[PDB]
Design an enzyme around this catalytic site. Structure first.
Site, PDB file in Angstrom:
ATOM      1  N   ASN B   8       0.894  -1.136   0.000  1.00  0.00           N
ATOM      2  CA  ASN B   8       0.000   0.000   0.000  1.00  0.00           C
ATOM      3  C   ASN B   8       0.944   1.200   0.000  1.00  0.00           C
ATOM      4  OD1 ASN B   8      -1.870   2.051   0.560  1.00  0.00           O
ATOM      5  ND2 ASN B   8      -2.686   1.110   2.406  1.00  0.00           N
ATOM      6  N   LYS B  10       0.179   4.221  -0.038  1.00  0.00           N
ATOM      7  CA  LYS B  10      -0.490   5.308   0.706  1.00  0.00           C
ATOM      8  C   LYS B  10      -0.368   6.628  -0.040  1.00  0.00           C
ATOM      9  CE  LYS B  10      -0.501   2.987   4.969  1.00  0.00           C
ATOM     10  NZ  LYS B  10      -0.207   2.938   6.398  1.00  0.00           N
ATOM     11  N   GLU B 162      -4.674  -5.644  10.848  1.00  0.00           N
ATOM     12  CA  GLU B 162      -3.660  -4.638  11.017  1.00  0.00           C
ATOM     13  C   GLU B 162      -3.902  -3.937  12.343  1.00  0.00           C
ATOM     14  OE1 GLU B 162      -4.519  -2.225   7.426  1.00  0.00           O
ATOM     15  OE2 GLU B 162      -2.427  -2.643   7.115  1.00  0.00           O
TER      16      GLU B 162
END
Lengths: 245, 245
Positions: B8, B10, B162
């Site tokens: 990811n 982000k 997570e």
């Protein structure tokens, strides 16, 4: 003040249909005197800047307030500039009332977008309950102060008055209603910033603008253009760009 | 269960630096037993799908719950699919805790993205206060139920545990901490959906996974892979993809 019309595509389009909309815009007879920007879905900003004529500007529909970080789902001014867009729409009513963006957050995003050299179309507007209670002025001056207190250089800012009751409803404000708040907002600018900022800042109107009603609204003395929603996905957007002709 | 690692990115990168990251991944010898997918910023999804080798998947970092409409700043599953991306990350802790997305909203986004034919990486996780209060199981079962209520076909879903306290902090969950909730999650699925879904759904861990960390976490029996954030922007992402080799 140069007439300004922005088209906000919102969450609409794919590459085939925005490809043909762009082909129409590039071939259209557009007013030499109008500054036009198209606000594209983030996933299509690169495509739209690659396909639109350089004369038409591209606007991101939102951005966040720092250049990079652990903000999944967000894009920054640095990335928008990277793709070649030159504007971002901030404070739009769906971002305020659907997604909960507060005035303090919108003020931080304006300050960041402008520090990164983007132009900002900063949106403000009251809801129907507030209009009917007689507090339209108070609400739009409070939202405008939260933007203005974070603007150092006004040359890149366009104010967009969009009453919430007029977006997507077909309930366009009358020329007299639009003109009333555009004049009141221009007066706030003269008193709180300066007279030079008040006469150079474009204050545009949005909320059910069509090719049918745009000439009456465009002739008002303090309406400097439009932020077009639904009609910007149609060929009539060319008639709205040309609303002064 | 095929070992899965998602990166990811982000809100990081520009075309120059992401093209370099992509060139590294395309050139690297990545284990053919790992399913890998990169979660690009929405502005770079089209660019990433074009430059990445077809064996690497592309994921959007967020989407909304309808095909089109007046939702400035949002993208839909139909747009993601139009770009040729096959996945979307939903329920990520920043979207939940910084942007306020609720379990009810995430569930609606899961049901709509799967209906549209996208694969979903659905994230769940407790904050530090909940872990210290000892209610980890209560919190993630609650979040999992929200997603499960909206899943009709599990073959396109990957659950990502997570813990919020492990994201971006450097404080990785220990192999035994991660194994303990992956195992409870897989039992939850066994009792509440079926044994076949419990057996075949990949449950991945995320939260400060590094090249140094990954081999011992990956050797746990119910950890089927990783959701990688900060280290997905580095050369060591290759080692994490190759953690079982």
């Amino acid at each position: 003040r140069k007439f300004f019309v922005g088209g906000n595509w919102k969450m609409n389009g794919d590459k085939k249909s925005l490809g043909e909309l762009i082909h129409t815009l590039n071939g259209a007879k557009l007013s030499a005197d109008t500054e036009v920007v198209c606000g594209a879905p983030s996933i299509y900003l690169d495509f739209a800047r690659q396909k639109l004529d350089a004369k038409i500007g591209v606007a991101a529909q939102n951005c966040y307030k720092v250049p990079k970080g652990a903000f999944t789902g967000e894009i920054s001014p640095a990335m928008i500039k990277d793709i070649g867009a030159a504007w971002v729409i901030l404070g739009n009513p769906e971002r305020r009332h659907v997604f909960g963006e507060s005035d303090e957050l919108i003020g931080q995003k304006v300050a960041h977008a402008l520090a990164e050299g983007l132009g900002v179309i900063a949106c403000i507007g009251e809801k129907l309950d507030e209009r009917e209670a007689g507090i339209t002025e108070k609400v739009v001056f409070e939202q405008t102060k939260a933007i203005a207190d974070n603007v150092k250089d006004w040359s890149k800012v366009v104010l967009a008055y969009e009453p919430v009751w007029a977006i997507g409803t077909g309930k366009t404000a009358t020329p007299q209603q639009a003109q009333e708040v555009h004049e009141k907002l221009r007066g706030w600018l003269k008193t709180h910033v300066s007279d030079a900022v008040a006469q150079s800042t474009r204050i545009i109107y949005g909320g059910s603008v069509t090719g049918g009603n745009c000439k009456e609204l465009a002739s008002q003395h303090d309406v400097d253009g439009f932020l077009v929603g639904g009609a910007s996905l149609k060929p009539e957007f060319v008639d709205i760009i040309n609303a002064k002709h």
